[PDB]
Design an enzyme around this catalytic site. Structure first.
Site, PDB file in Angstrom:
ATOM      1  N   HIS A 118       0.825  -1.203   0.000  1.00  0.00           N
ATOM      2  CA  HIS A 118       0.000   0.000   0.000  1.00  0.00           C
ATOM      3  C   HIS A 118       0.863   1.260   0.000  1.00  0.00           C
ATOM      4  O   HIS A 118       0.659   2.167  -0.816  1.00  0.00           O
ATOM      5  CB  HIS A 118      -0.939  -0.027   1.215  1.00  0.00           C
ATOM      6  CG  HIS A 118      -1.772   1.204   1.374  1.00  0.00           C
ATOM      7  ND1 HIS A 118      -3.116   1.230   1.089  1.00  0.00           N
ATOM      8  CD2 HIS A 118      -1.457   2.447   1.805  1.00  0.00           C
ATOM      9  CE1 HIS A 118      -3.593   2.439   1.326  1.00  0.00           C
ATOM     10  NE2 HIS A 118      -2.606   3.200   1.768  1.00  0.00           N
ATOM     11  N   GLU A 119       1.853   1.331   0.895  1.00  0.00           N
ATOM     12  CA  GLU A 119       2.665   2.542   0.973  1.00  0.00           C
ATOM     13  C   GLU A 119       3.524   2.710  -0.278  1.00  0.00           C
ATOM     14  O   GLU A 119       3.677   3.819  -0.784  1.00  0.00           O
ATOM     15  CB  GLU A 119       3.561   2.533   2.208  1.00  0.00           C
ATOM     16  CG  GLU A 119       2.862   2.242   3.522  1.00  0.00           C
ATOM     17  CD  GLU A 119       1.609   3.059   3.739  1.00  0.00           C
ATOM     18  OE1 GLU A 119       0.759   2.611   4.535  1.00  0.00           O
ATOM     19  OE2 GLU A 119       1.471   4.137   3.135  1.00  0.00           O
ATOM     20  N   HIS A 122       1.607   4.204  -3.066  1.00  0.00           N
ATOM     21  CA  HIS A 122       1.533   5.651  -2.972  1.00  0.00           C
ATOM     22  C   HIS A 122       2.726   6.304  -3.661  1.00  0.00           C
ATOM     23  O   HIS A 122       2.572   7.291  -4.383  1.00  0.00           O
ATOM     24  CB  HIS A 122       1.510   6.100  -1.517  1.00  0.00           C
ATOM     25  CG  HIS A 122       0.168   6.002  -0.854  1.00  0.00           C
ATOM     26  ND1 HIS A 122      -1.013   6.281  -1.510  1.00  0.00           N
ATOM     27  CD2 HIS A 122      -0.172   5.689   0.422  1.00  0.00           C
ATOM     28  CE1 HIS A 122      -2.021   6.129  -0.670  1.00  0.00           C
ATOM     29  NE2 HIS A 122      -1.538   5.776   0.510  1.00  0.00           N
ATOM     30  N   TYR A 154     -13.470   5.494   3.600  1.00  0.00           N
ATOM     31  CA  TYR A 154     -12.051   5.820   3.495  1.00  0.00           C
ATOM     32  C   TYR A 154     -11.591   5.556   2.065  1.00  0.00           C
ATOM     33  O   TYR A 154     -11.314   6.503   1.309  1.00  0.00           O
ATOM     34  CB  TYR A 154     -11.247   5.015   4.508  1.00  0.00           C
ATOM     35  CG  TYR A 154      -9.801   5.448   4.583  1.00  0.00           C
ATOM     36  CD1 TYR A 154      -9.453   6.636   5.194  1.00  0.00           C
ATOM     37  CD2 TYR A 154      -8.801   4.679   4.010  1.00  0.00           C
ATOM     38  CE1 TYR A 154      -8.119   7.048   5.250  1.00  0.00           C
ATOM     39  CE2 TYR A 154      -7.484   5.077   4.045  1.00  0.00           C
ATOM     40  CZ  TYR A 154      -7.147   6.259   4.666  1.00  0.00           C
ATOM     41  OH  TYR A 154      -5.844   6.648   4.700  1.00  0.00           O
ATOM     42  N   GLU A 161      -6.075   6.574  -1.955  1.00  0.00           N
ATOM     43  CA  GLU A 161      -6.101   5.391  -1.103  1.00  0.00           C
ATOM     44  C   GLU A 161      -6.692   4.198  -1.853  1.00  0.00           C
ATOM     45  O   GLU A 161      -6.201   3.069  -1.732  1.00  0.00           O
ATOM     46  CB  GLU A 161      -6.888   5.677   0.171  1.00  0.00           C
ATOM     47  CG  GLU A 161      -6.392   6.889   0.952  1.00  0.00           C
ATOM     48  CD  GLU A 161      -4.963   6.760   1.460  1.00  0.00           C
ATOM     49  OE1 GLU A 161      -4.392   5.649   1.488  1.00  0.00           O
ATOM     50  OE2 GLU A 161      -4.406   7.803   1.852  1.00  0.00           O
TER      51      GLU A 161
HETATM   52 ZN   LIG Z   1      -2.504   5.260   2.351  1.00  0.00          ZN
END
Ligand SMILES: [Zn+2]
EC number: 3.4.24.89
Length: 196
Positions: A118-119, A122, A154, A161
């Site tokens: 996930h990071e 980004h 979210y 995201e």
């Molecule tokens: Zn995130």
């Protein structure tokens, strides 16, 4: 097919991207995180390396690092009213990547199916692809499919995201890859064309 040689090739690439921390920590689990990152298409990993993006593995809190001291006491976007702050958050991605060792799994202070994917997504989004999650094409897809991985208040609200989580689903394993294709077929195709 099982592609252990591809994983090894990506691990060699990651040897110039990952930064291990100073303290003592679970070295086997840090290795497991690098192994999970090795699932990412090598094209993206080498693009990150080209931009000198470092994937920092941490043995303490994010805000214990000098460069993240500005986040002490700050409430993450979308976490208002929870009493939680970046001090407790195990991963950050964007212009940098920082990851607390041991916190990979969903629910370990974060909502992602996998922290490091996930990071890192980004960073690929922001650094390599010039905020493609904000592109007109992805915004159209997000409008339709952005809630279909859940966490509707979210992921369903913040396209960066939803991009990062979909990327993590695409590359974590074949089960999550299949779940993404079924729930978010246009997002799956988008990531397919992006890697094509
Ligand atoms: Zn995130």
């Amino acid at each position: 097919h099982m592609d252990s040689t591809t994983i090894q090739q990506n691990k060699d690439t990651l040897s110039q991207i990952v930064v291990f921390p100073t303290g003592n920590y679970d070295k086997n689990e840090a290795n497991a995180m690098v192994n999970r990152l090795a699932n990412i298409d090598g094209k993206y990993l080498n693009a990150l390396k080209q931009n000198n993006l470092k994937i920092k593995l941490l043995s303490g809190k994010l805000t214990d690092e000098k460069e993240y001291a500005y986040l002490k006491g700050v409430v993450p976007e979308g976490w208002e009213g929870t009493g939680k702050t970046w001090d407790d958050v195990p991963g950050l991605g964007g212009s940098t990547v920082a990851l607390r060792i041991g916190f990979s799994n969903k629910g370990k202070g974060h909502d992602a199916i996998n922290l490091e994917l996930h990071e890192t997504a980004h960073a690929i989004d922001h650094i390599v692809l010039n905020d493609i999650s904000k592109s007109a094409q992805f915004k159209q897809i997000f409008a339709k499919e952005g809630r279909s991985l859940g966490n509707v208040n979210y992921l369903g609200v913040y396209p960066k995201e939803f991009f990062a989580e979909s990327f993590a689903y695409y590359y974590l394993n074949q089960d999550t890859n299949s779940k993404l294709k079924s729930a978010c077929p246009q997002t799956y195709s988008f990531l397919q064309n992006l890697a094509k």
